Amino acid sequence: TSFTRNIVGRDGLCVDVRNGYDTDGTPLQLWPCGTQRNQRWTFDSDDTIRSMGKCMTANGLNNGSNIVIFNCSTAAENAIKWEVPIDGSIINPSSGLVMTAPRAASRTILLLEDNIYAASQGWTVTNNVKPIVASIVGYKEMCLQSNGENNGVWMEDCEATSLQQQWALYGDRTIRVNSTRGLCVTTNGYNSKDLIIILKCQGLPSQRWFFNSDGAIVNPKSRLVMDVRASNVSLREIIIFPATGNPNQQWVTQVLP
Ligand SMILES: *[C@@H]1O[C@H](CO)[C@@H](O[C@@H]2O[C@H](CO)[C@@H](O)[C@H](O)[C@H]2NC(C)=O)[C@H](O[C@@H]2O[C@@H](C)[C@@H](O)[C@@H](O)[C@@H]2O)[C@H]1NC(C)=O
Ligand SMILES: *[C@@H]1O[C@H](CO)[C@@H](O[C@@H]2O[C@H](CO)[C@@H](O)[C@H](O)[C@H]2NC(C)=O)[C@H](O[C@@H]2O[C@@H](C)[C@@H](O)[C@@H](O)[C@@H]2O)[C@H]1NC(C)=O
Ligand SMILES: *[C@@H]1O[C@H](CO)[C@@H](O[C@@H]2O[C@H](CO)[C@@H](O)[C@H](O)[C@H]2NC(C)=O)[C@H](O)[C@H]1NC(C)=O
Ligand SMILES: *[C@@H]1O[C@H](CO)[C@@H](O)[C@H](O)[C@H]1NC(C)=O
Ligand SMILES: OC[C@H]1O[C@H](O)[C@H](O)[C@@H](O)[C@H]1O
Ligand SMILES: OC[C@H]1O[C@H](O)[C@H](O)[C@@H](O)[C@H]1O
């Protein structure tokens, strides 16, 4: 009824108890992922998340409050309970605030903030601390492909040798250009028919994605899903659009060798 994993977030960095200290109040931070105990988090049936025998704890329940390690028996019960929504948030149910990495850098301190469905608020609970590398196969069994920073993504015939068809599925719920991992699949707005492009990863809601159980790739802020515009691969436009279940909105990941 408990199991232990790493927690991967912004830029593929892991949730880490700072300096490996277990003193009550020690802040959580981002740090490159490893096997050290201060990165091993045990998920207990009581909705606590523990490292080094102590609990992930909200040091306050306000926008901007720090998250720390703290003795599980002496902390406030409201401060040590966490849920893991399917879209990859880590939420404190009492406050409704979510774990956020406000900067990408090593040593960034983790805060509880208002949920804006930002990529800075995306996490993955896993023992694999490397991004998953896959092709994204969609409409007509074609492959999603990048075409440079600031340019659109679009469909092409799947090629084992096309590097721009290779995507790094990061723990922060970003979809990155595998060869250029500073770049993220980004919606150019939150409205229906806004185009999906590649932009520098900046932790934004426009860069957060969720692979749901219907084969859709969902942008949580907008609610909208990746769509091959007009079921017309020749337009070379992928947009966000409301979920319809139609073939031009169906996607599956295919792991690469
Ligand atoms: C909760 O904390 C956030 C970080 O302090 C606030 O957002 C930040 O607001 C700053 C100005 O106060 C702004 O320069 C930051 O870039 C922005 N950060 C991001 C990425 O959102 C947030 O403030 C609200 O949202 C911002 C965008 C503005 O609209 C503010 O007027 C809002 O108050 C804080 N939210 C709350 C509940 O106050
Ligand atoms: C969390 O805080 C608890 C209360 O201060 C610690 O339990 C207390 O540990 C004291 C020092 O070991 C001991 O004199 C007390 O009997 C005990 N108090 C209670 C109510 O159990 C607790 O320490 C852990 O649990 C106790 C029972 C022993 O097994 C300790 O050696 C454990 O470390 C603190 N937990 C942690 C992880 O620090
Ligand atoms: C995706 O990109 C990664 C990162 O560049 C590639 O992984 C590197 O591969 C080289 C050659 O095998 C290794 O020596 C490095 O250790 C890898 N780096 C990291 C950080 O993992 C990878 O080959 C690319 N393609 C695929 C299919 O994963
Ligand atoms: C698909 O898009 C291409 C490129 O713009 C266009 O020439 C073609 O007529 C479109 N096909 C349909 C059925 O609209
Ligand atoms: O705080 C920086 C760094 O300190 C040590 O190197 C720890 O082992 C890491 O896990 C990390 O916490
Ligand atoms: O115009 C955009 C819209 O075009 C058609 O209606 C498609 O079926 C939708 O999925 C969407 O692509």
What's the CA gap between 23 and 150, in Å, rounded?
A: 45
What's the CA gap between 30 and 49, in Å, rounded?
A: 16
Q: How many Cβ atoms from other residues are within 10 Å of residue 141's Cβ? A: 10
Q: How many Cβ atoms from other residues are within 10 Å of residue 237's Cβ? A: 18
Same domain, 8 and 114: yes
Same domain, 30 and 126: yes
Domain around 207: 131-255
Indicate the top mutation candidate among 15, 16, 41 to test ligand 5's pocket, ranked by most ligand atoms within 8 A of CB. 16
- Which of 93, 114, 130 marks a domain boundary? 130
Give the tokens for residue 52.
């080094």
Nearest by Cα to 56 from 79, 84, 23, 88: 79
Q: What is the resolution of this structure in A?
A: 1.5
What's the CA gap between 158 and 164, in Å, rounded?
A: 10
Same domain, 163 and 206: yes
Those residues whose C-beta lies under 8 Å from the C-beta of residue 208, and which sit 6 or more positions away, are 117, 118, 119, 121, 122, 172, 173, 174, 219, 220, 221
Indicate the top mutation candidate among 191, 195, 229, 238 to test ligand 6's pocket, ranked by most ligand atoms within 8 A of CB. 229
Question: Of all atoms in ligand 2, which is nearest to the CA of residue 72?
Answer: 1
Q: How many Cβ atoms from other residues are within 10 Å of residue 152's Cβ? A: 19
Task: Find the 104 Cα to ligand 1 centroid distance in Å.
Answer: 17
What's the CA gap between 28 and 66, in Å, rounded?
A: 8
Proximal ligand: closest to the CA of 29: 5
Same domain, 122 and 9: yes
**CA-proximal residue: ligand 6, atom 7 (nearest):** 230
Proximal ligand: closest to the CA of 69: 2
